[PDB]
Design a protein around this ligand. Structure first.
Ligand code: CLA
Ligand code: CLA
Ligand code: CLA
Ligand code: CLA
Ligand code: CLA
Ligand code: CLA
Ligand code: CLA
Ligand code: CLA
Ligand code: LHG
Ligand code: BCR
Ligand code: ERG
Lengths: 38, 54, 179, 174, 136, 743
């Protein structure tokens, strides 16, 4: 019953990391919309 | 009392055909023959009624 | 007649459960422990018992005093209007914040530990006043059974409180005093 | 061979429940005897309760429900909304918790006597095994007389234009 | 049981099925201008052509571009004759490359040349006869 | 006699996460470590292939029963999602108040990157994306009037999904049936015929009689949805049902007395569409469900199971034998009881055919209310079921080939229909190929000829109504017979089954619901095109299944397997010779056939059926009679259909339909990206990957998992997947945008 190892596999870790990245991007886009030319 | 008479006749016909086909007399054959007789009697009665005979 | 083994039902074959604190009833007519872990179910039952006891006493206590600084436009404590207004004013939002914090930071580790076979279900080691005595001895198993029974009664009484209030549009004390 | 001459030995003679072997259709030969016996005892208990309830409700009504029809059909239709609905809810709960699994286990090999529960508060079952056997045979014997009785009462009420059992026994017979 | 190997010898790439081989089928396939015993290549070609041009004229006269004009039959006949000439050209080419010098038995250069000549003559005559029938 | 008994193994498989941390554990080769990037693809390619994992049929049967439960749970979660979306983010009540004016919508887009524009002004207060799934019409037909019922249904669906999750886990780790179970085809068929379908239709008929009928009757009578009594009230208070339907006054007595004719108020056979909503009469639908339930129940007592009465499928199969078929159907029973691939092939072909039939029957005889007036929903549903049916058919062929390559046995298939077919497979495929050539010439050549004639100004020499005419006399005749059936062959039917055959037109909300679909020369040519494409795709699939084991080119294709790249550059070239490749080609052909089929339905419906009706009966279609003379030429199909109707999907920018336009472009990209994988080989990509790997090596950043190019078979699969995705998405966006912008 090694759930940590499974959660550490490539698909799970990749989906979690990309989900966090997309969430950060979206959150930044609603708090700071239509960002251009810094 | 035409419908009950037709249903009883259909049940007897079903019993005869069931005994012949299955070749045995038991509760299983009895219920199966009764089901067949009912499926034949219900249809005959409804068909005759649709024709105005009964 | 009956089968070779018996259950308090007097007509059932004893399940895997034997004699646990407050579990002498072996009340498992529908197979729930045969497929699901016993520790998981025990943890859930104790958590339900505790939250329900607080809810029953809370419903009765809320009908006497509202602190005077909370609007409380509705005198029915188990009504959706009161729940929504307290959620909007932030009181229930803060209860949710801290209760979720406890469940994630501590509740989840506690359940994982009890599911692995290390922590007894519903044992948080909270004994400020030595009321239960030593763990796993006299005054503890009996007290644990008492907690389980009081919690089950509180759960059934909370269901009754909610249904009665929603059907009579009257409080518990108000309904007890009139019809 | 059996109590009925035309049918053959219906089996189920070495089991418990009734010395007489009345199973002309040999339904037991194609169904579990324990399950059928459990259904039979359940029918008997329900029918006996219904018979007493029919002879009681038609004679006296509780202060509550003051205005309510006494006929089985009328009473059912008038109470199928709140009273009988609640009765059904609780009886169904009892069957769901203790009813269905009991029969399931009995059929799956449990040694439970069909129709057995631990409901013997006054200890009227008896001490001697013979007394217990006679008592069970009496419960089933008294039953099957209440099932037929309930069917007869319902038919008489329907054919008598909603007439009570005693009322019909005192006014007319046809 | 009706389906059997063509020559009663398995491992052959053919099957003796009902319409494939039958009393009626064997009789019909046989006796045709081709496959009939005692028929010179020219006679086979003449029969085949007179039977081909006859039905070949139909399509051109009935659905030709000039099917609505007063020369629909003549235009269709000319088109059929041209198609017949092209087919004869193909036949002669096939005989020129496929067959070599040997006895005239329909499988030689001379045999296929006679067959082609007969086919051309028969096709032209059949087309003309059909055109005459249509005009009359 | 065999006892139809249940035997199971307890705690056969332990429940633990130990195997979750070892990808490829199910395969002996995949459990030794990747060593290359191809292992990642092989892990997913052979994940659901339970027959390759173990050689035991019992284990495969258990792995299928479970995972079937998982898919059932997935379907229940999806259904719960649809119901919750309807209850929380949809204008269902507003739509009920004004079904014709309010556009169905159950999706609300979050305002984040300007995507809030997608919230179309569908009406009813809320603004969102218009749904063309027919969820609103279905819910209305089911009697739903308030969102509380939708919420309860969503909760019930979630509970059912949880049950299907528990059942799947329990039937693999707590109680796994043995191979004797799953081989009781007689019992499985009896139960599925009388319990899954028979009792299911019976229960639905009861629900319609007690819920759909009264609620819909009140809705169609001008009663507000909030004022209609609750469904339970119609059951408790029989007075209401009696008032709405006097037949209920008699109760169930007429049923038991065979006086079924007394149920003429609820069990009608009107035959036509309701003039108020445009759909089938709910009474006819309830009567139909009752009849189908009784018929299925009677059919469910045919096979023999644990009793003397019944039939044996093996005996019936072996009994059918003739002179032209030596052993008839002998050995087929053992084939369908020892190989899940054969059963899957038959079931997939039938399920796909059933879906296609469903599409046709649903558009012609709109069953749900206000379904015909909602052209977007009609187009989407016909096209959707048409596509799912075609995909299931291609899958059926693929699984037939799989069984032929792996589960085939010469002893079992000896002198039977299957063996006799494999014997003359050359006659089958050459004659079928000849039919395909003839169909293509006489179908596409007619179109090409018309193009050539119109371009030359010789319109008098075309295959049209004015010029040479090709009228579907047989189909037109069947239509006339259907038009006259309600009075000479359907005595009790009061109207034609479908108004598409004839009779009169039906208009609801100033919109045409269903009018006679007249067939002409254009329909003759398009129908022949459909037949031609179906013949070529079935030829490809049949060829792949018949030669799956061997052929004159490769004498031992079976030993090579069902899914192998090729035998090499020998014998002139043996590329795409395996059956899997035949399925790969059949996918493109099925896509072509289905695309042409949906194109015909869309254009014909928009030019001769769908449209508006002005007062006094004047009819004006979306594309007024242009299909009669424009669908007879490829130029017309490109100008009047692909170019004229695309203006809505290309000009959708700046509005709520902009998303569709975006998807219209994206799909194209995908369809063009597939070409990359279809016109290329892995040798070149492997060399390019070698150079890239050298670049990585120069920086000490090379990966342990040696990068490799996609396998030949994997490359073909990726190419076909992208091709189908792009094409179907392009036609999806085009259809949805065109039908939503207008009509
Ligand atoms: C699986 C599908 C299904 C299901 C689950 C149900 C379920 C139900 N149906 Mg139903 N029904 C169905 C399909 C289904 N139906 C079909 C296909 C039809 C034919 C179209 C009907 C037609 C139908 C009718 C007409 C009625 C129901 C009714 C009912 C409800 C009570 C049935 C009952 O026991 O009353 C029993 C009624 C009887 C009359 C019993 C018959 C024998 C009695 C004992 C006669 C003896 C005389 C006695 C004094 C009673 C006088 C009755 C007389 C005045 C009518 C019940 C919830 C009833 C209802 O509750 O309405 C809302 C109702 O009247 N159904
Ligand atoms: C994964 C990356 C990510 C990140 C970095 C953030 C960051 C932030 N979110 Mg956010 N969020 C995310 C994902 C993320 N979110 C997702 C996937 C959802 C669901 C679509 C939400 C929904 C959400 C809401 C509704 C709100 C925020 C808010 C906020 C800000 C509040 C301050 C804070 O520190 O809380 C940190 C928060 C996180 C790190 C994410 C936790 C999200 C949890 C699951 C709460 C959402 C509950 C949801 C309504 C119901 C169940 C969801 C289910 C997944 C369990 C903040 C900086 C609040 C805000 O607007 O500030 C004014 C607010 O109202 N988020
Ligand atoms: C021996 C006495 C008797 C009499 C006098 C009648 C008289 C009648 N019956 Mg009837 N019937 C009887 C016995 C009798 N039946 C019995 C014993 C049964 C049980 C087997 C039935 C079952 C039965 C049914 C199911 C039906 C009738 C119907 C009818 C009426 C019209 C049938 C007709 O002639 O149209 C002639 C019809 C045709 C020539 C068309 C043939 C059927 C088409 C082509 C459908 C083909 C279906 C498909 C290809 C095959 C099945 C597929 C499978 C998946 C289901 C008619 C008044 C019909 C009815 O309901 O009346 C309104 C009807 O549907 N009967
Ligand atoms: C959340 C409620 C809940 C839960 C999770 C449990 C869980 C447990 N109980 Mg407990 N119990 C409860 C409520 C609950 N109980 C109440 C209210 C009275 C009792 C009285 C009781 C006794 C006397 C005993 C237990 C025991 C046990 C343990 C073993 C038996 C079992 O697995 O049952 C599992 C039960 C559930 C998982 C709850 C789900 C059951 C259904 C699906 C919920 C719906 C019920 C519904 C409200 C009934 C409506 C009735 C209506 C139709 C009339 C187990 C840890 C035995 C034990 O060994 O104690 C340690 C024992 O002796 N219970
Ligand atoms: C494959 C589809 C197709 C079809 C059905 C037609 C059909 C036709 N075209 Mg057309 N055409 C086509 C494709 C097609 N074309 C294409 C693709 C082009 C562009 C290159 C053209 C360009 C074109 C032009 C320029 C013209 C036509 C014309 C015509 C008409 C007369 C042609 C003619 O005389 O041929 C002759 C046909 C035959 C000699 C024999 C046909 C085969 C026979 C009937 C088969 C019998 C088999 C039999 C049943 C087997 C069993 C028998 C055995 C057992 C005994 C005709 C209706 C002309 C016209 O004016 O249009 C009306 C014309 O000028 N076409
Ligand atoms: C009348 C009894 C009955 C019924 C109603 C069903 C119904 C079903 N069976 Mg099933 N089956 C039965 C008896 C029955 N079976 C018997 C006796 C055997 C052994 C011979 C099998 C062996 C069998 C196999 C091997 C498979 C099925 C599968 C399925 C499902 C097909 C998928 C589908 O169409 O989605 C429709 C889904 C629904 C309409 C939802 C309804 C679901 C509920 C729970 C009804 C099913 C009741 C269930 C059969 C018995 C309850 C057991 C109890 C202890 C809880 C479907 C739900 C397939 C499947 O999907 O696997 C899970 C499949 O692989 N059956
Ligand atoms: C009930 C339907 C059904 C079922 C149960 C099966 C079951 C099976 N199939 Mg089959 N098949 C089906 C339908 C079905 N198929 C259909 C409809 C087709 C035609 C498309 C096929 C064509 C097919 C082929 C050619 C093959 C199989 C194979 C197999 C077996 C292994 C599957 C596997 O492990 O691959 C793993 C599955 C994947 C890696 C997923 C691939 C994803 C594709 C591209 C679909 C993407 C859909 C999605 C909507 C895309 C948009 C979203 C995107 C942007 C992310 C397995 C027993 C294989 C086999 O037998 O092994 C030798 C085999 O080669 N199937
Ligand atoms: C739409 C058609 C299409 C597209 C888009 C491409 C694109 C590409 N080709 Mg190409 N090709 C095509 C058709 C196409 N080809 C055809 C028909 C042939 C003839 C067989 C070729 C033959 C060919 C050869 C021989 C070669 C290429 C090469 C390349 C790559 C060049 C480098 C580059 O620009 O990288 C930039 C990347 C892109 C342009 C792709 C866009 C980025 C994507 C969309 C982002 C990732 C996915 C995104 C997250 C969304 C998906 C999410 C998921 C959940 C579904 C590039 C990816 C060369 C190469 O390998 O370059 C090194 C190479 O040598 N192609
Ligand atoms: C001729 C009258 C039928 C009209 C044609 C359309 C019929 C539809 C059924 C399709 C099969 C064709 C019927 C003959 C077939 C038929 O039923 O023959 C009879 C025979 C079945 O009789 P048996 O004695 O073998 O019966 C024992 C077994 O059937 C046990 O059930 O079938 C064959 O063995 C040959 C199978 C195909 C033979 C090759 C023909 C392929 C051509 C396919 C195209 C058909 C025409 C297309 C439409 C124009
Ligand atoms: C598929 C089909 C069919 C068909 C049939 C047929 C086709 C028949 C016939 C026929 C034909 C197709 C015929 C033709 C013909 C021709 C003729 C009869 C002619 C003639 C004569 C003459 C007059 C000649 C002349 C000449 C000259 C002028 C010179 C040179 C040489 C010659 C000799 C050529 C059948 C019905 C079976 C079946 C169904 C359908
Ligand atoms: C989810 C509830 C509502 C239902 C009743 C659960 C029933 C569980 C699965 C249990 C209860 C009694 C049955 C039970 C009896 C005895 C056991 C022993 C134990 O090794 C588990 C299996 C096993 C052999 C089975 C599993 C299946 C049953 C039916």
């Amino acid at each position: 019953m090694n759930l940590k190892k499974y959660l550490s596999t490539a698909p799970v870790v990749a989906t979690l990391w990309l989900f966090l990245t997309a969430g950060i991007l979206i959150e930044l886009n609603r708090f700071f919309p239509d960002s251009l030319f810094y | 009392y035409t419908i009950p008479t037709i249903m009883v006749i259909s049940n007897l016909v079903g019993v005869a055909v069931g005994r012949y086909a299955l070749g045995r007399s038991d509760l299983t054959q009895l219920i199966a023959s009764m089901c067949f007789g009912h499926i034949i009697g219900v249809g005959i009665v409804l068909g005759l009624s649709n024709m105005g005979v009964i | 007649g009956a089968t070779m083994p018996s259950m308090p039902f007097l007509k059932r074959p004893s399940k895997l459960d034997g004699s646990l604190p407050g579990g002498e009833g072996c009340f498992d007519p529908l197979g729930f422990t045969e497929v699901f872990s016993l520790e998981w179910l025990r943890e859930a039952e104790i958590k339900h018992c505790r939250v329900a006891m607080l809810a029953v006493l809370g419903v009765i206590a809320q009908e006497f005093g509202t602190f005077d600084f909370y609007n409380a436009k509705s005198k029915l404590q188990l009504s959706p209007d009161l729940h929504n207004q307290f959620v909007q004013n932030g009181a229930l939002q803060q209860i949710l914040l801290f209760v979720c914090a406890w469940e994630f930071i501590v509740g989840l580790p506690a359940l994982i530990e009890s599911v692995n076979g290390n922590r007894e279900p519903g044992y948080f080691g909270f004994d400020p006043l030595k009321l239960g005595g030593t763990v796993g001895s006299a005054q503890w198993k009996r007290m644990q059974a008492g907690e389980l029974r009081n919690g089950r009664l509180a759960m059934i009484a909370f269901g009754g409180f909610f249904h009665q209030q929603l059907l009579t549009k009257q409080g518990i004390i108000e309904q007890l005093a009139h019809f | 061979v059996p109590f009925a001459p035309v049918p053959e030995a219906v089996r189920e003679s070495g089991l418990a429940g009734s010395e007489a072997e009345f199973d002309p259709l040999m339904i037991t030969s194609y169904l579990p005897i324990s399950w059928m016996r459990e259904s039979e005892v359940k029918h008997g208990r329900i029918a006996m309760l219904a018979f007493v309830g029919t002879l009681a409700q038609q004679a006296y009504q509780f202060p509550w429900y003051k205005g309510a029809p006494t006929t089985l059909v009328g009473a059912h239709d008038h109470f199928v909304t709140t009273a009988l609905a609640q009765i059904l809810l609780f009886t169904s709960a009892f069957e769901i918790v203790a009813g269905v699994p009991a029969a399931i286990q009995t059929v799956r090999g449990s040694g439970r006597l069909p129709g057995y529960y631990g409901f013997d508060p006054l200890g009227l079952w008896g001490k001697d095994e013979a007394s217990r056997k006679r008592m069970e045979l009496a419960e089933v014997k008294n039953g099957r007389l209440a099932m037929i009785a309930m069917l007869a009462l319902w038919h008489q009420e329907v054919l008598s234009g909603g007439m009570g059992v005693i009322e019909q026994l005192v006014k007319q017979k046809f | 049981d009706y389906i059997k190997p063509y020559n009663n010898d398995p491992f052959v790439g053919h099957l003796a099925t009902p319409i494939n081989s039958s009393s009626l089928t064997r009789a019909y396939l046989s006796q045709l201008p081709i496959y009939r015993r005692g028929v010179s290549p020219f006679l086979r070609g003449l029969e085949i052509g007179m039977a081909h041009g006859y039905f070949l004229i139909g399509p051109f006269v009935q659905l030709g571009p000039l099917r609505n004009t007063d020369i629909k039959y003549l235009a269709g006949l000319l088109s059929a004759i041209g198609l017949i000439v092209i087919l004869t050209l193909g036949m002669l080419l096939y005989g020129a490359v496929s067959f070599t010098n040997d006895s005239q038995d329909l499988e030689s250069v001379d045999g296929w040349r006679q067959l082609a000549s007969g086919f051309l003559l028969g096709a032209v005559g059949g087309a003309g006869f059909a055109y005459l029938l249509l005009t009359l | 006699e065999k006892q139809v008994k249940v035997v199971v193994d307890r705690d056969v498989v332990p429940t633990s996460f130990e195997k979750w941390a070892k990808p490829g554990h199910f395969s002996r080769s995949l459990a030794k470590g990747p060593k290359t990037t191809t292992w990642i693809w092989n892990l997913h390619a052979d994940a659901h292939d339970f027959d390759s994992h173990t050689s035991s049929l019992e284990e495969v049967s258990r792995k299928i029963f479970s995972a079937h439960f998982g898919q059932l749970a997935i379907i229940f979660i999806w259904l719960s999602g649809m119901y919750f979306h309807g209850a929380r983010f949809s204008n269902y009540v507003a739509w009920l108040s004004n079904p014709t004016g309010i556009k169905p919508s159950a999706q609300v887009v979050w305002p984040i990157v300007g995507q809030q524009i997608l919230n179309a002004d569908v009406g009813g207060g809320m603004q969102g994306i218009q749904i063309t799934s027919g969820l609103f019409q279905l819910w209305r037909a089911s009697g739903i009037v308030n969102e509380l019922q939708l919420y309860v249904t969503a909760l019930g669906g979630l509970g059912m999904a949880g049950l299907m999750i528990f059942a799947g886990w329990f039937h693999y780790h707590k109680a796994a049936p043995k191979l004797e179970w799953f081989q009781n085809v007689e019992s499985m068929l009896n139960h599925h015929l009388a319990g899954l379908l028979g009792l299911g239709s019976l229960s639905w008929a009861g629900h319609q009689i007690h819920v759909s009928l009264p609620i819909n009757k009140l809705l169609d009578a001008g009663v507000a949805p909030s004022s209609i009594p609750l469904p339970h009230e119609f059951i408790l208070n029989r007075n209401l049902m009696a008032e709405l339907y006097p037949s209920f006054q008699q109760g169930l007595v007429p049923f038991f007395t065979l006086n079924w004719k007394q149920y003429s108020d609820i069990l009608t056979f009107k035959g036509g569409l309701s003039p108020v909503t445009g759909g089938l009469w709910l009474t006819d639908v309830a009567h139909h469900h009752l009849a189908i339930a009784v018929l299925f129940l009677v059919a469910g007592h045919m096979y023999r199971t644990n009793w003397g009465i019944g039939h044996s499928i093996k005996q019936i199969l072996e009994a059918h034998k003739g002179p032209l078929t030596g052993e008839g159907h002998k050995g087929l029973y053992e084939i369908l009881t020892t190989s899940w691939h054969a059963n899957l092939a038959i079931n997939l072909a039938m399920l796909g055919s059933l879906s296609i039939i469903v599409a046709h029957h649903m558009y012609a005889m709109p069953p749900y209310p206000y379904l015909a007036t909602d052209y977007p929903t009609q187009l989407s549903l016909f096209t959707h079921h048409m596509w799912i049916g075609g995909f299931c058919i291609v899958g059926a062929g693929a699984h037939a080939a799989i069984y032929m390559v792996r589960d085939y046995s010469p002893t079992v298939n000896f002198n039977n229909v299957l063996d006799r077919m494999i014997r003359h497979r050359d006659a089958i495929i050459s004659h079928l190929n000849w039919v395909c050539i003839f169909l293509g010439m006489h179908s596409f050549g007619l179109y090409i000829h018309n193009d050539t004639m119109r371009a030359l100004g010789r319109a008098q020499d075309m295959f049209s109504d004015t010029a040479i005419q090709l009228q579907p006399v047989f189909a037109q005749w069947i239509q006339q017979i259907h038009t006259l059936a309600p009075g000479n062959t359907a005595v009790n039917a009061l109207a034609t089954a479908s108004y598409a055959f004839g009779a009169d037109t039906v208009t609801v909300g100033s919109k045409i619901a269903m009018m006679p679909i007249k067939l002409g020369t254009a329909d003759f040519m398009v129908h022949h095109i459909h037949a031609f494409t179906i013949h070529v795709t079935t030829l490809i699939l049949l060829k792949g299944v018949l030669y799956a084991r061997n052929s004159r080119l490769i004498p031992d294709k079976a030993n090579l397997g069902f899914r192998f790249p090729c035998d090499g550059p020998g014998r002139g070239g043996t590329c795409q010779v395996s059956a899997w490749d035949h399925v790969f080609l059949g996918l493109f052909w099925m896509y072509n056939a289905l695309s042409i089929v949906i194109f015909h339905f869309s254009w014909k419906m928009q030019s001769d059926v769908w449209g508006t009706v002005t007062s006094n009966g004047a009819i004006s279609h979306i594309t007024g009679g242009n299909f009669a003379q424009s669908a007879i030429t490829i130029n017309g199909w490109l100008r009047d259909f692909l170019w004229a109707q695309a203006s809505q999907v290309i000009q959708s920018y700046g509005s709520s339909l902009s998303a569709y336009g975006l998807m219209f472009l994206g799909a194209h990209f995908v369809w063009a990206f597939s070409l990359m994988f279809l016109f290329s080989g892995r040798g070149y990509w492997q060399e390019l990957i070698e150079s890239i790997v050298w670049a990585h090596n120069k920086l000490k950043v090379a990966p342990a998992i040696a990068p490799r190019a996609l396998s030949i078979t994997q490359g073909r699969a990726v190419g076909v997947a992208h091709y189908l995705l792009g094409g179907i998405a392009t036609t999806w966006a085009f259809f949805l945008a065109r039908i939503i912008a207008v009509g």
